[PDB]
Assembly symmetry: D2
């Protein structure tokens, strides 16, 4: 049921049909059930073909993006906000046609370091806009999942609590939270506590280390995270995330400030990630079983 | 508002009026507002006096004992068992007369390293007995609080979960858990998870480090403990325990195996522990409020 | 003879003499005994008066800045680099005249998100230039401590090991490391490991929580940090750092992306930070001694 | 070369020949490279047949005991002490006959809950005694490895620091520390700190969880442990150890106080442990490597 996926960009930024094969094959060989893509051009990509290959391998697909400056759905500039809505519509169309059920990533504002404090108007404009978009998405068989990111990557929703308040403000029953452990460790008071507080409104989870390298080679208490996810009975998808300057686009390198590369071999990276996640989850499950064991003699 | 207690044996073993006075004074000068007594001589100690001396000082009181071998209410020997009930009934009365509302400690079995594995009949025997002792305690306006201890100190209730199931077996509505962080860290799958699991059934709490010295100088995750307590909204008394063999009776000193002394200055020990617990709970409270902060612009 | 400090901007961002006065009195009431100032204009401020008021209170002083994009000493454009050196030289004379021993902060490159990936020539330029400014600093009786910051605030020195290498390249013995727990938790593989790796090259430390709010209210493992400092016998100054949109000036709020404020009462915040760092170090002192205890009978 | 090994009590509580040989097979199936026979009676054991299957299975071997009360080498009573020498001589022999390199377990004093606080005489006696036995073991090409245990399992050596001092007192170069994370978590101030303090003198390591069941299902910071071991360049044997009421003795089981059914499926247990240790160590290695990466552009 629950899929454990990986971000395509671990493998390749290239949207060439040949590079897409290697991405999908690597994903499968590394041990994952799901691929997350962040860019696809129908013009260059045969979406219909791509959709069938993803099914043929037994993989699931998710689509996540990050709104560009000129596509900021929360902008007072009405033309900018409209391109934001247009991108989201295109992204939903793509996700539906591709076989996926989730649209994820930074959907509420532009992705990047803003040069101005947020305002209530921004918050409300974004909320009213996502209210409507989420309808489009439902009609398409797709959920919206707002990614909560750190202060340097958006000025709006930084916290699960912020996310929850926003979602209420939307009024939608088709908007959920996309939580990322790399972002949570910067912004949340406890990562485990955030997850618990967000129970039932979590639609998608990124697993990324404090520095975005190998899982377990950083500062994040992953046992604490796997315990919380187990406590709440999270049974939806989760995806590994790590990036290299050598692989990702330089729009993204300059934006997520990847100045140094923490690994050179992505198959080793992904393979480790998959054993780390797999075993972390198993342990957490066994531990939850043990807590409640009566141990009557 | 609930009391932050200390155990007397931190101060001395002696029950002599002159020591009783020092014990209470030191307790206050350390910042604590509850005193825990384990031994109180039936013949040598004025109860109604002590009961007055306690309230005068703005101190709460609790009584904890560890059932001796020859008094194990779980023993098949109806005489040895009977000795246990009298020990209990006498401890209930001393508690009531002292102005305290909880009896605690190892109440369900002998305090010590048992020689045989636990049995189903041993279990039922203790529950059947404690069931009836509980109604006595009720009539006295006192509560029973079963300490859950490590494998070496009882063979019967080592875990919060088995402690929870035992209480279901008694059918009593006046029995609760006494959890101790030193024991919990040995037996529980996850101290915080065990606390969450027992919520609403915890009547008393013992704060003690992994090695039984200064708080924060061992291996226990006290932040996680405070977070859990905060999460389940615990509002009942708790006390610090930490033992020196130069201070405590050679009986308990052999029963809990104090071979080393981790401290010489118990005022510095107690002042440190008070600051540790106070700041700890404050910090966990601010953290739980922060988790839920809508940070709406 | 180490000081426990606090950054002025916890109190006020203003240079008015009445506000500078308040900053100082607040520092003392909170229990700190150093003050860190970000920058003060000599024509705007009665410097000698300030220095005399600092010494009268019994406070020490450090100055930290972050080079402007306008003044980046790593820049190829010489004019920009020269503006850097001149800002550096002025900051030194400020520290010296105020009766301080440390110039800290981002001293190696522009403070902010960079649009270019780092280069070796950028590295060498900064090294070459700082090698010289260190001599100026020595003559003035002051050390240069290079702040190591997260990817979003500089593109050059993000890691304690990067700093070590960088320092190595400067050939200087008046350039040390300025480590910041908030930055370390994002970039380092292990905060404690990184501290241990940097032994005898650490000139200054910022204590700040993962979200930059109240200490212990985030994800940073501070016990591990106090243990590492203690393992290396760190005997120099460290300061508490937390900021509020309400108090800082729009330049800093925007560069460090303070979108939401985690506290409102900065006296409570400071007193708390004082107890937390105070206790934290005492506890780490207690424990590192326990480790070694022979405990022979 | 070093091996990741396993304690026989995962598999069997028996010294019957077929059981011993099952043990070997189960060890190899679980991915382990060493077997440790604990509390083995060599009477009625075909050493040659056993040593043959070890070779076929590609296994290392170690022998671990805990001295009985009437074999306590630290006793004043000379008859009791001479018997403990004879037990040790016998177990040295069996180790050599089986192709082992290590004698291990509670070799310094009686394995159990002493009713006596330790004395300098006991210390000195045991030390002088073991200094001789060490020479015996050297001649047989075998190292001695003192297991440091918790307060309820010996009264002499509970702490790595004590053990370290003890080995100073024996004058030997053939006695080493055998540390156990289960005991360390109860006794040590900090497990990593203890491991770093004992560096160079660590001969053998047990990996066991707080409650002695599944690795990671209890309270122990295993990351910290694998980190410390990595930092000191530990390059000797370590072994998984776990107890459940399913497999029990009437000797070791009684001493270790095992009352609870933490597992029934010892092959799942072992394969999880094997993956845990395996992955934990790779993760530790990658992390330490990362700490000192220069990341110069
Ligand atoms: Mn993400
Ligand atoms: Mn207790
Ligand atoms: Mn800083
Ligand atoms: Mn062991």
């Amino acid at each position: 049921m629950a899929r454990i996926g990986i971000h395509s960009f671990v493998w390749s930024a290239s949207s060439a049909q040949s590079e897409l094969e290697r991405t999908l094959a690597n994903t499968r060989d590394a041990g994952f059930d799901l691929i997350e893509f962040s860019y696809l051009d129908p013009a260059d990509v045969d979406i219909g073909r791509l959709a069938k290959r993803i099914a043929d391998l037994g993989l699931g697909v998710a689509i996540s993006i990050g709104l560009p400056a000129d596509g900021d759905i929360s902008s007072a500039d009405k033309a900018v906000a409209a391109r934001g809505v247009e991108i989201l519509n295109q992204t939903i169309a793509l996700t539906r046609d591709l076989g996926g059920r989730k649209v994820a990533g930074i959907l509420s504002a532009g992705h990047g370091l803003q040069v101005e404090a947020p305002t209530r108007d921004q918050w409300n404009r974004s909320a009213a806009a996502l209210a409507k978009v989420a309808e489009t998405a439902k009609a398409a068989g797709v959920t919206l999942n707002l990614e909560i990111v750190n202060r340097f990557e958006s000025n709006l929703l930084n916290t699960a609590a912020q996310g929850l308040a926003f979602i209420e403000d939307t009024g939608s029953d088709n908007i959920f939270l996309h939580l990322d452990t790399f972002h949570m460790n910067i912004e949340e008071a406890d990562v485990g506590l955030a997850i618990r507080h967000a129970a039932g409104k979590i639609g998608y989870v990124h697993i990324g280390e404090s520095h975005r390298g190998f899982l377990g080679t950083g500062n994040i208490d992953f046992a604490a995270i796997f315990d919380a996810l187990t406590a709440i009975g999270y049974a939806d998808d989760l995806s590994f995330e790590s990036f290299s300057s050598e692989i990702v686009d330089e729009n993204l390198s300059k934006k997520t400030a990847i100045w140094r590369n923490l690994w050179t071999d992505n198959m080793a990276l992904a393979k480790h990630a998959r054993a780390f996640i797999g075993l972390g989850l198993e342990t957490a499950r066994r531990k939850a079983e043990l807590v409640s064991a009566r141990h009557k003699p």
